[PDB]
Amino acid sequence: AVGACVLCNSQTSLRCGACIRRPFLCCKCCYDHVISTSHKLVLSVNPYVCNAPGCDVTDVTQLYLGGMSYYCKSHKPPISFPLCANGQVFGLYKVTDFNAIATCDWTNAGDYILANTCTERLKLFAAETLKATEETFKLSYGIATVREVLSDRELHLSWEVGKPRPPLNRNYVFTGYQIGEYTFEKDAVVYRGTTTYKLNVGDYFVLTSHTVMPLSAPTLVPQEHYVRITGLYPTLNISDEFSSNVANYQKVGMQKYSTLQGPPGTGKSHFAIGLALYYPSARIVYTACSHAAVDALCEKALKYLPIDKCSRIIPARARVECFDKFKVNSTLEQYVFCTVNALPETTADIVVFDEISMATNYDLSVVNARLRAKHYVYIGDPAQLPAPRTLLTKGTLEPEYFNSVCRLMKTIGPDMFLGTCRRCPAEIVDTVSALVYDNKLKAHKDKSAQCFKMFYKGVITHDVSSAINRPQIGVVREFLTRNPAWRKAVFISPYNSQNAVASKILGLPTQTVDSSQGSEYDYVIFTQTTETAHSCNVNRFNVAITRAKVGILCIMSDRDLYDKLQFTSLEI
């Protein structure tokens, strides 16, 4: 019951009882909160409730101190002082933004904007409040019971009436009942258990409701600039492969933290592994939110770093298959590759946090809490996709609001920028450079003359809210008959249901724009499917077309993005 005020640190016995996180609020701040919001329950050792028997007065503005006890206006003794007066609430040791975070439902973009523009202590309050709000929202969905199992990868389900049905995509990972986590894809549904089990008829599934721990560490530690490289010892014999990043690796040792904006295929992973070769004695912990992002760093390390000094940390509760070439769960290795949610409590000379656009302020704070480092490097791209905000339904979340690191990269600029894309044909590089990089992204490859665009709105159908465009898939099928080299293309769309229909009709491997992030393919066939804000999102658009090494076919719905594509137009 005794803590520090979550806005001005002034110690207090007061906590807000109406706040879902019950933050410690001081006398002067607690008052400013309760007088401005519907939040009136104040908590101490004992709550601020009318001590008189059978009285349900809990509002702190309607209460008084009757010597040492608390009473309402109807039960107070003559010698009683109001709890609320003179800009203070009676407490021991005797903000408009805090009120908005404390009371919002997290469905508006303006809520996330504030959660990033506010002070550092309010960013942590916003991050735990949001995550707890996101968790309690998991209880607000219906249960799915197994009616019949058709095969090892397909079954039928009975849904709970009254409670809404969750979207059947990769994003939502259910918990089977204790038969492990279970994913699904759209009455014939495709079941995918994270544990191979003979699905029982009668068994049911419920969403993974995890406990929101409190945040102690800031999203970003305070910046320190040094005159020399600190606690790190550079090589003189530096591989010419990594010579392009020498000045940036030196910048890394002369700052507490550094930001790196690496557009698609500009050398982010190469930069991260090369930092290990530049400071060969430094213990480095490689982290990211996803297992796929941690695995991509493991792949590059396997090629340049000694396999004996590496360890891939796998949480005992396995959710997907992982990188199996390093020693598993050896926390004391020089190189430790681990997802944020699985990080052990340890120290490092350098912490490298990759795919920074996918991180939330919650993850930024967890990393600062689980890892104590001499240097922190944040690598990613604010022009790529952020983490999904399941509660956000109104307004669009701009890149400067993804997290603290992205806010810095978009306002003051990144400390380091990888300006040459070595993956994409120049048609794609020139398009995304103008679209999201203010003409600063350069092409290393020449124009491939294999980048096509087709303006074809088609017909939009819906599998609930996930969209399908069968005519756009028809146009692709027609193109494939005339272009057999594209037989090896990966099909990409903004919708899982579009991808499910394309997988059956075209037989091409399928990927949503969001799941393709961090991956590359020689050929990519992209159908925009709709002209919604989701399918027209410039960050999603940038990720979609930058997956291609050689060629891309874009069947577009939006005139704007189609006209922006510096591709050869096709007819039919």
Distance CA 26, CA 78 (A): 27
Of 75, 121, 312, 547, which lies in the binding site for Zn ion, with binding defined by CB under 5 A? 75
382 touches 359 (CB < 8 A): no
DSSP 30-51: HHHHHTTSS---EESSS-SS--
CB of 392 to Zn ion, least distance (A): 22
Kind of pairing between the strands at 204-207 and 174-176: antiparallel
Using CB under 5 A, which of the segments 19-27, 257-265, 352-360, 492-500 binds Zn ion? 19-27
Q: Which residue, 31 or 286, has its beta carbon nearer to Zn ion?
A: 31
Residue closer to Zn ion (CB basis): 25 or 502:
25
Q: Distance from CA of residue 301 to its chain's centroid?
A: 24
Residue (19 or 340) nearer to Zn ion, CB: 19
Residue that is written with structure tokens 């103008």 in the block: 434
Q: Which stretch binds Zn ion (CB under 5 A): 12-20, 80-88, 371-379, 395-403?
A: 12-20
- Smallest distance from Zn ion to CB 344, Å: 34
Rounded distance between C-alpha atoms, residue 339 and residue 321, angstroms: 13
Length of the chain (residues):
572
Tell me which residues in 483-512 interact with Zn ion (CB under 5 A): none
CA pair distance 496, 130, nearest whole angstrom: 26
- Closer of 50 and 379 to Zn ion (Cβ): 50
Q: Please, which residue, 12 or 183, has the CB nearer to Zn ion?
A: 12
Instruction: Report whether 263 belongs to an annotated binding site.
Output: yes
DSSP labels for 315-329? -SS--S----SSEET
Minimum distance of Zn ion from residue 71's CB (angstroms): 6
Residues 13, 14, 18, 294: which binds Zn ion (CB under 5 A)?
Answer: 18
Candidate residues 13, 15, 16, 358; the one interacting with Zn ion per rule CB under 5 A: 16
CA 267 to CA 308: how far, in whole Å? 24
Q: Does 55 show up as a binding residue in the annotation?
A: yes
Question: Rounded CA gap, 10 and 292, in Å?
Answer: 43
126 touches Zn ion by CB under 5 A: no
Q: Footprint of Zn ion on residues 421-480 (CB under 5 A)?
A: none
Q: Smallest gap, in angstroms, from Cβ of residue 138 to Zn ion?
A: 22
Q: Are 114 and 126 in contact (CB under 8 A)?
A: yes
Give residues 22-61 in contact with Zn ion (rule: CB under 5 A): 26, 29, 39, 50, 52, 55, 57
Q: By CB neighbour count within 10 A (0-12 exposed, 13-18 middle, 19+ buried), where does 140 fall?
A: exposed
Q: Would the annotation count 5 as a binding residue?
A: yes
First-to-final CA distance of the chain: 71
Q: What is the H or E stretch that residue 365 is in?
A: helix 361-370
Confirm whether residue 8 is marked as ligand binding: yes
- Choosing from 3, 4, 8, 461, the residue that interacts with Zn ion (CB under 5 A) is 8
Residues 6+ apart with CB under 8 A from 316: none
Tokens found for residue 321: 């298959």
Number of residues this chain uses to bind Zn ion (CB under 5 A): 17
Report the nearest approach of Zn ion to the CB of residue 393 (Å).
Answer: 23
Q: How far is the CB of 140 from Zn ion (least distance, A)?
A: 21
Cα–Cα–Cα angle for 566, 569, 570, rounded to 5 degrees: 155
> Is residue 186 part of an annotated ligand binding site?
no
Closest approach, Cβ 368 to Zn ion, in A, equals: 23
Q: Within positions 87 to 106, which residues make up the interface with Zn ion, using CB under 5 A?
A: 102
Compare residues 125 and 486 and give the one whose CB is closer to Zn ion. 125
Q: Which residues of 179-215 are buried (b: 16+ CB within 10 A; e: fewer)?
A: bbbbbbbeeeeebebbeeeebeeeeebebeeeebeeb
Q: 82: number of CA atoms within 13 Å, CB side?
A: 11
Candidates 72, 127, 272, 297: give the one binding Zn ion (CB under 5 A): 72
- 130, 392 contact by CB (below 8 A): no
Out of 13, 14, 19, 424, point to the residue binding Zn ion (CB under 5 A): 19
33 assigned ligand-binding residue: yes
Tell me which of 7, 100, 114, 424 binds Zn ion, using CB under 5 A.
7
Binding-site residues for a ribonucleoside 5'-triphosphate? 262-269
Binding-site residues? 5, 8, 16, 19, 26, 29, 33, 39, 50, 55, 72, 75, 262-269
Binding-site residues for Zn(2+)? 5, 8, 16, 19, 26, 29, 33, 39, 50, 55, 72, 75
Residues that bind Zn ion (CB under 5 A): 5, 7-8, 10, 16, 18-19, 26, 29, 39, 50, 52, 55, 57, 72, 75, 102
